[PDB]
Amino acid sequence: SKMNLSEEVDLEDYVARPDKISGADINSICQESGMLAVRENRYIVLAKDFEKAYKTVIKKDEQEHEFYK
Amino acid sequence: SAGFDRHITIFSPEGRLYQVEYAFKAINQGGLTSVAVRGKDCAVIVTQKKVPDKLLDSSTVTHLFKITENIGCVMTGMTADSRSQVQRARYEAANWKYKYGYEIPVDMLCKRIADISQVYTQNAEMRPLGCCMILIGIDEEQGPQVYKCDPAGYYCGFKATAAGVKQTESTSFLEKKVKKKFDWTFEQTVETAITCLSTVLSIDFKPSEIEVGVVTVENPKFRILTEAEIDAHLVALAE
Amino acid sequence: MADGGSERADGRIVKMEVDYSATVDQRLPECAKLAKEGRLQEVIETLLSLEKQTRTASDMVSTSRILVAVVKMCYEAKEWDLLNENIMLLSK
Amino acid sequence: EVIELPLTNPELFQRVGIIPPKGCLLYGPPGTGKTLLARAVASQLDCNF
Amino acid sequence: EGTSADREIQRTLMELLNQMDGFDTLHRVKMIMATNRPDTLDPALLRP
Amino acid sequence: TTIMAVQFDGGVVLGADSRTTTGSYIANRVTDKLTPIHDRIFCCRSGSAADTQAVADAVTYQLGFHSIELNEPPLVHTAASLFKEMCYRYREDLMAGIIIAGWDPQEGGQVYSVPMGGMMVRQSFAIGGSGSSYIYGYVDATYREGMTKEECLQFTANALALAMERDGSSGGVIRLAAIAESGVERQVLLGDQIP
Amino acid sequence: TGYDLSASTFSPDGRVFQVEYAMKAVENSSTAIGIRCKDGVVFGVEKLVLSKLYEEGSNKRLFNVDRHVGMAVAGLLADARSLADIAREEASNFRSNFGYNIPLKHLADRVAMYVHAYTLYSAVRPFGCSFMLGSYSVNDGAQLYMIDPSGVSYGYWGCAIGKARQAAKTEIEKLQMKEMTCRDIVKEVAKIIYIVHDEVKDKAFELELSWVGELTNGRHEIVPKDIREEAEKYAKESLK
Amino acid sequence: GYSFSLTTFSPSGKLVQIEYALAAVAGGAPSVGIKAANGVVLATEKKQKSILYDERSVHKVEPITKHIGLVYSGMGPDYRVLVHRARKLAQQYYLVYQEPIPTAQLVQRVASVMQEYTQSGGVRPFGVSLLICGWNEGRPYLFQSDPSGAYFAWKATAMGKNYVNGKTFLEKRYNEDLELEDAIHTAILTLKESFEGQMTEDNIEVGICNEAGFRRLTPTEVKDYLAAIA
C-alpha cells in the first residue's frame, strides 16, 4: 500500500507461490522491485520488476557444493 | 565449525567436511576456466591455454587429454593432480574393454573416477586431489554425452558445464543460452562454447589461446582441433 | 605500415572513382591486413581509418552513383565485421 | 548512479515509496581501489566527505 | 568475538543499520559502506 | 595350424587356415587364426586355442594402454616384445607359437616369429604350425626378394594351400590379410590355389 | 599458519604449503641452464666448489638417466640422486618390457608421477629437488622437459632452475635456439651461466657442461674437455 | 578433546562424531517412505541446482534386488558406495542360499557395513540414511538404516530437511488400510509440504515395491500422480 504499485500487478500470484519467505524476505522483494523500477526510471513499479526481485530474494542455496545434497 | 575439522577429513558440527570443501577451491587456484557444451549430434570441450613464456612448447602444455579413442576429457585444477586422474581414467577404461569385452560408457568412466575420489574422502591418509574432470564421448542410444566429476566424488551429467575460476558466471551465460529452445549444431556448439569463455573472460582470445576438442556422431573419435580450424570458427562467430 | 597505408589509399582512390563498387571489395583484404597488424595499434588504426574514410566516400557514391542507400547498410555491417575480427578490448 | 538519484531527488524515491538506499560497498583489491579512489568519489559528487 | 574482547565493531555495525534507516536518514545523505577492509560482511546488511 | 607372413616393401601379407581340432574332430571349420592386436599390427596364432586367445587379448590390452599413454602408433617390435615376454615367462604353462606381423611408420612392414620358447626373430618370411613342416621347401624355393603385395598374396595362398592338403590338422578356408600404411584388407579364399 | 605442517592437508584458501616450501629450497640452489638447440639439448650447471678440499667432480649436479636421456638437478643433491635412481629404474624397465629405448616424453611423465605421489601422503615430505631431462633421438628429434618439486612436467625450448632462473631465462630468450648449431650453443650456455654466476656472493664455482645430440649420436656424454675450455674462454672474454 | 574422534568415549554420554554424521543426514533432500497394505512407496526431492544438470543421469531411488529398493537422505557420494555393497550382499546371499535376500536380513547386513566405518580409525562414518523397502514373505517391509548402524522399521517415515514437519504430516494422514496408489498420493503430498518450488515430473523421483518388484516410476507416471491433485 505504501508504494505506488503497477495497479495491474496481481500480488496474490506471488503469495500463492510457495518457498519459506520470511517477513524480512517479503520486505526485500517489495523494496527491490521498487528499486529495479527506479534503476529503469519507472515511477510506477511494474509486474516484471516484482518477478526479478522475487527470484533474487529466493537465492535459496545460492552457493553450496552439490554433495551434502 | 572452523578450527574443528580444518586439519583432518572428519565430520564437523552441522556435518560439514572442511578438507573436501577446500579441494573444490584448489581447482580455482589453477587460474584457468573450461567450458563443455552438448549438442544435437556433437560434444565440444573448450579451455583457455596460457603460454606463460615464449620459451615453452605450446604442444606440451595441453589440458585436453584423450582417455580412449572415443573418450576425451578436459582437466581443470592442479597439473600434477589432473595427470594422475588421467592415468587412472585410462586404466579403468582399458580394464573395461579387458574385463567386459566392450568400450567404457562415458557415464561408467565417471562413476569409477568418482568412486576412487569418494574413498579418499571416507578413509584418511590421502589428499582429495585438486582437479575436476569433464568427459565427452558419444554413446549409442544415449547421443553425445557430457559428464563432470568433483573432488568430493560427486558426478553428474550436464547439458552444459564449466569449471575453474569463472564457473559460476560461465554457467549463468550457458543457462540463458540453454533456456533458448533451439538445439545446437557442431558450428553452434563450438560457437556457444567459445562465446561463453569470451563473454566471461572478455579476452577476445586469438586462435592460439583457446584449445577445442570435439567428438561427433559422424566421427566418434575424440579430435583435438588444429589451430587453423580453431581460427576459422573464431573468425566466423565474429562475422 | 604507415607508408603502405598511404600507398593503399592513393592506389585505390583513383580505382574506386573509376569502378562502380568492386574496388571497395578489392581494398577489403588490405583493411583485414591492417586490422590484423598490431605493431603500432595507433598509426595502423589511422590507416584502417583512412580505408574507412574511403568507405565513407564509397557510401557517398552508394547514395549517388549506385542505387541510393542500397550498399551503404551492407558496408556499415561490413565495417562492423572488420572491427569484429580484432575488437582489441574495444580499444585502438 | 545509485548515489545520484536520491541526492538529486529524494522525493522521486518517496513517490516510489522505497527508502533511498543508505549505502553501497566498494569491495575491491587493496590499494588499487582502497588507497586511491577512496576520495575520488568526493570529486564525483563534488563535495568533501 | 573473544573472551578478552568481543565483536564490539559487529554490534556497532548492527547499531549502524538502525541509525542508517529510520532514526537518522535526512538531507539525502548516503552512508555508503564503501570499504573492502571488513573481513566479514553481515548477510542482513546485504539485504536490499 | 598353418600360419605364414611375408614382408613386402610397403607392408606385410599374413595368411592362415581355418581349423581348430580336438583329436581328429574339427571343433571349428571356420576359425579366424589371424587377430588384430592393434590397428596396423596383427598376430596369427598357432598351438592351443585357449592359450593363444588369452595371450593375444592380454597383449591387445597392454599395447592399447601404451599407445594412448604415449599418444603414438605402436611399433611392431614392442608388440612382438610383449608377446615374447609373456611366452618366455610362462613357457612351461603356455603352448602357443605366434607370428607378429604389422606395419609401423618408423621401420615399415615387418614380420616377427616367436617360437614356443619365447625367442624372437625378425624374418622376411615366417611359417608356423603343424602344416609348416610340409611347406618348408616351397617357402624357401618360391620366395624371391622384392615380391609385390599381389605376388606375396599369391605366395601365401599357394603355400598355405599346399600345407593344408598334406596336414590333416590344417584345412578349410585360407584367411588372408595385407597390412599397409592405408590399413588392412582381409580376404577369405574358399580353398583356392588348388595344385 | 598451522595448516602448513601436513602435505596431506589443503589450506582453507585451497593450496598445499608443504609443496610450496619444497620449491623455495629449489630456489635457494645454484642455477642450472638447459637450451634445446635443433641438433640436441645442451645442459650447463653452475656447480659451486666449497672448502676447496673436495676434489673436482665431487657433488656433480649432472647425471645420466639413460644412455640417450640426461638430467640436470637443482636443489638438495641427495633428493636428486634418489630421483635419478627412480628414473634409471623406469628407463631400465621400459627397455626391459617394451623392448625399445624410453621415449623422453614417457620417462618424464613417470618420474613426475613419483614426485607427485610424495605430495599426497603425510608420512613422506614432497621432494625438494627440481630436475630437467634432455635427450636426442632420430625419431623424436631433440626433446627437453623440466619437472618441478610438485611433479609438474612441460616441454621447454630453454629452461633454468635455481636462484637465477628468471635472470638466466631472460638471457636464454635472446639466443636463436630454434636454428642454432649445438657446438655454438655450448658456448652460449657457458656465457649465460657466467652472466648469472654472481661470483662475488657464491665465491668459487665449477662449470659442468652436458651434451646430447646428432654430434653425440644420441648419447648424453659430458662435453669433451677443451670444448668446455673454449666455452669458458668465450664466456670470460664476453664477461669483460 | 571429545567430538574429534569416534575411538574415544564421551566423558559422560556418547561419542559426538556419530551425532555429527546424523547432522549431515539431516541436511539432505527430503525423503518420504509410506508402507501401505499392498506395497511400500518411497520418494525423494530431486531438484537440479541449475537447468543445465541432466535429470536423467544419477538416480536417487536405486534398485538393489528385484524386490528390494533403497532411497537416501545425506551426502550423495556415500550413497553410491552402500548402494553397490548392498546389491553385492544380495547377490552373495543368492549364490549361498539360492533365494532372493529377505528384506529384514538385507537391512541387518547393510547396517553391519555402515557400523564398520563407525569403528575406530581414520575412516569416517557414512553421511547417508537409507530407506530399504521389500515385498518378501508376502508382507510389505519398510526399514531405516542409520549411519550409527541401528536399524528400525517405520509404517511411514521422513528424513532430510523438515523431517519433523513431514513426520507430523504423516501422523495426521497415514491410516493403515490404504492401497499403494493412495500411499503414492500421500508420499507426494509430504514432499510438497517441504518442497521449495513447484513439483514437476523431473523434480520428484518416486519408487514402488509392490508384490511384483521394486520399479522406479517412469517420469510420465510420476507426472500423472503429480497431476490430478497430489
Ligand SMILES: CC(C)C[C@@H](C=O)NC(=O)[C@H](CC(C)C)NC(=O)[C@H](CC(C)C)NC(=O)OCc1ccccc1
Ligand atoms: C590357436 C588355434 C587356432 C590352433 C588350434 C589348431 O587346431 N590348436 C588346437 O586347437 C589345439 C590342438 C593343438 C595342441 C595341436 N587344441 C585345442 O585347443 C582343444 C580345444 C578345442 C575346443 C579347439 N583342446 C584343448 O585346449 O584342451 C587340451 C589342451 C590343453 C592345453 C594345450 C593343448 C591342448
